[PDB]
Amino acid sequence: LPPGPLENSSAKLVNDEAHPWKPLRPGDIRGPCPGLNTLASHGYLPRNGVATPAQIINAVQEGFNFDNQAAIFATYAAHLVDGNLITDLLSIGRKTRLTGPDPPPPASVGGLNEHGTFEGDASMTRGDAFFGNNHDFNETLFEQLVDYSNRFGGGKYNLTVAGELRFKRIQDSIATNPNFSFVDFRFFTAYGETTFPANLFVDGRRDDGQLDMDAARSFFQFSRMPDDFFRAPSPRSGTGVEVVVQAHPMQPGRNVGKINSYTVDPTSSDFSTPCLMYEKFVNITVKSLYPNPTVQLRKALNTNLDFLFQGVAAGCTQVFPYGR
Numbered sequence: 476l477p478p479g480p481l482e483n484s485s486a487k488l489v490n491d492e493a494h495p496w497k498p499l500r501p502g503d504i505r506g507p508c509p510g511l512n513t514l515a516s517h518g519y520l521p522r523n524g525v526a527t528p529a530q531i532i533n534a535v536q537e538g539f540n541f542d543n544q545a546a547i548f549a550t551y552a553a554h555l556v557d558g559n560l561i562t563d564l565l566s567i568g569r570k571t572r573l574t575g576p577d578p579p580p581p582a583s584v585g586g587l588n589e590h591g592t593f594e595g596d597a598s599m600t601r602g603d604a605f606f607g608n609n610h611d612f613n614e615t616l617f618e619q620l621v622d623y624s625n626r627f628g629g630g631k632y633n634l635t636v637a638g639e640l641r642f643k644r645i646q647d648s649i650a651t652n653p654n655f656s657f658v659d660f661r662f663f664t665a666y667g668e669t670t671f672p673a674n675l676f677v678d679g680r681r682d683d684g685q686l687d688m689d690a691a692r693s694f695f696q697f698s699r700m701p702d703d704f705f706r707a708p709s710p711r712s713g714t715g716v717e718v719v720v721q722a723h724p725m726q727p728g729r730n731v732g733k734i735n736s737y738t739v740d741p742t743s744s745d746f747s748t749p750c751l752m753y754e755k756f757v758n759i760t761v762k763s764l765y766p767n768p769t770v771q772l773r774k775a776l777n778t779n780l781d782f783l784f785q786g787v788a789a790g791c792t793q794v795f796p797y798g799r
């Protein structure tokens with residue numbers, strides 16, 4: 476079962492004796508998420524970067540005070556499209572035999588590195604998949620984050636910086652990635668993610684939304700908590716996302732095989748239709764990976780889809796692609 480919320484959600488030291496940072500060993504997997512990467516590199520998750528959904532939910536709550544609903548939604552969304560539903564294992568990065576025997580095509584079980592399932596374009600510190608690497612820390616992109624922090628955040632990363640950088644990244648992908656896609660699930664996650672450094676990488680004794688660049692580099696590049704890092708003082712995920720959207724409101728769309736051809740997609744969900752984002756994720760994205768599953772897969776899909784629905788913001792109706 477998905478873990479419940481923390482019994483005690485106070486700020487506390489999370490870079491502690493039981494959770495030291497260690498460098499990668501051969502075979503250890505890190506991916507496009509600096510949060511999960513850091514949890515793995517401090518042993519909140521298995522240090523090889525392969526974990527169960529329950530391990531992931533417990534780690535994001537314990538290590539960073541990610542809220543339960545967001546933890547559940549993200550984890551089961553990722554697991555459904557990138558994880559092995561039979562073995563209950565998900566790679567936080569590149570596809571690995573460690574997640575076990577694969578299901579039939581067209582399912583990929585590609586880990587979080589898979590492009591276009593969860594991971595997508597206009598990431599802050601990772602390049603678009605089209606440019607060759609959607610997962611490793613990129614120094615040039617991080618230096619741009621520092622520059623935007625200097626220009627809009629007084630040297631710190633905050634929601635104002637997020638609003639400007641989010642837009643810059645979109646516009647750079649429009650200008651250079653002929654395959655740029657910015658619809659549906661990615662349209663939502665691209666905004667929320669930009670709040671996470673301000674909400675979750677800021678020491679919880681401050682919780683002031685102003686992330687310094689030394690801490691930012693430590694998390695984004697080295698998957699390492701600052702010495703003496705306290706987690707956030709209460710559960711939170713994407714609060715302040717409205718600031719980021721309001722800075723430069725966008726419509727969902729994509730380039731259409733050429734640069735500078737961004738074309739709005741009226742079939743995509745947007746922030747006015749959050750339930751549509753959920754329904755399309757299940758009916759189209761998940762169903763297309765598993766169009767006619769065999770018995771054990773069908774049962775695992777339905778279980779994980781029920782868990783996903785627990786993380787859906789209130790008011791949406793559950794959909795059942797494989798029946799009830």
Ligand code: HEM
Pocket residue numbers: 507508509510511531535539541545546547549550553587593594595596597598599600601664668669671672675676
């Ligand atoms: C709850 C389970 C989570 C999963 C499965 C997950 C997975 C992912 C994935 C696949 C991405 C790539 C999005 C992209 O293409 O840019 C991403 C982005 C990101 N995640 Fe998470 N994430 C989770 C929770 C968290 C938490 C708790 C934090 C912070 C503590 C966090 C911080 C970030 C950041 C900062 C980015 C954007 C990095 C960048 O653009 O350079 N995530 N996440």
Ligand SMILES: *[C@@H]1O[C@H](CO)[C@@H](O)[C@H](O)[C@H]1NC(C)=O
Pocket residue numbers: 483484485486487
């Ligand atoms: C919760 O944890 C905090 C910090 O570890 C501690 O001070 C407090 O006594 C615990 N109990 C409650 C209910 O806050």
Ligand SMILES: *[C@@H]1O[C@H](CO)[C@@H](O)[C@H](O)[C@H]1NC(C)=O
Pocket residue numbers: 590591604605654656
């Ligand atoms: C290009 O976008 C398509 C969907 O429009 C996606 O299937 C594919 O993985 C993307 N390729 C790259 C390398 O960006």
Ligand SMILES: *[C@@H]1O[C@H](CO)[C@@H](O)[C@H](O)[C@H]1NC(C)=O
Pocket residue numbers: 602606613614615616
């Ligand atoms: C990092 O991002 C920059 C700017 O988009 C790009 O030129 C470069 O190919 C990427 N990779 C490396 C290793 O810098």
Ligand SMILES: *[C@@H]1O[C@H](CO)[C@@H](O)[C@H](O)[C@H]1NC(C)=O
Pocket residue numbers: 627628629633634635636684718
């Ligand atoms: C970010 O920092 C800048 C400069 O200190 C400040 O003007 C702005 O109000 C801050 N934004 C947020 C959302 O804290």
Ligand SMILES: *[C@@H]1O[C@H](CO)[C@@H](O)[C@H](O)[C@H]1NC(C)=O
Pocket residue numbers: 751754755758794795796
């Ligand atoms: C998803 O499929 C369900 C039937 O299982 C249907 O009721 C619903 O309208 C569909 N949603 C979308 C957005 O296709």
Ligand SMILES: Oc1cccc2ccccc12
Pocket residue numbers: 545546548549663664665666667668712713
């Ligand atoms: O927008 C989001 C909401 C909740 C969780 C997320 C995890 C990763 C990336 C984006 C997320």
Ligand SMILES: Oc1cccc2ccccc12
Pocket residue numbers: 545663664666667668712713714716
């Ligand atoms: O309201 C939201 C919009 C987009 C992404 C989010 C991620 C987490 C939590 C809330 C989010």
Ligand SMILES: [Cl-]
Pocket residue numbers: 480481541542543544710
């Ligand atoms: Cl919570």
Ligand SMILES: [Mg+2]
Pocket residue numbers: 507594595596597598601602603609
């Ligand atoms: Mg990306």
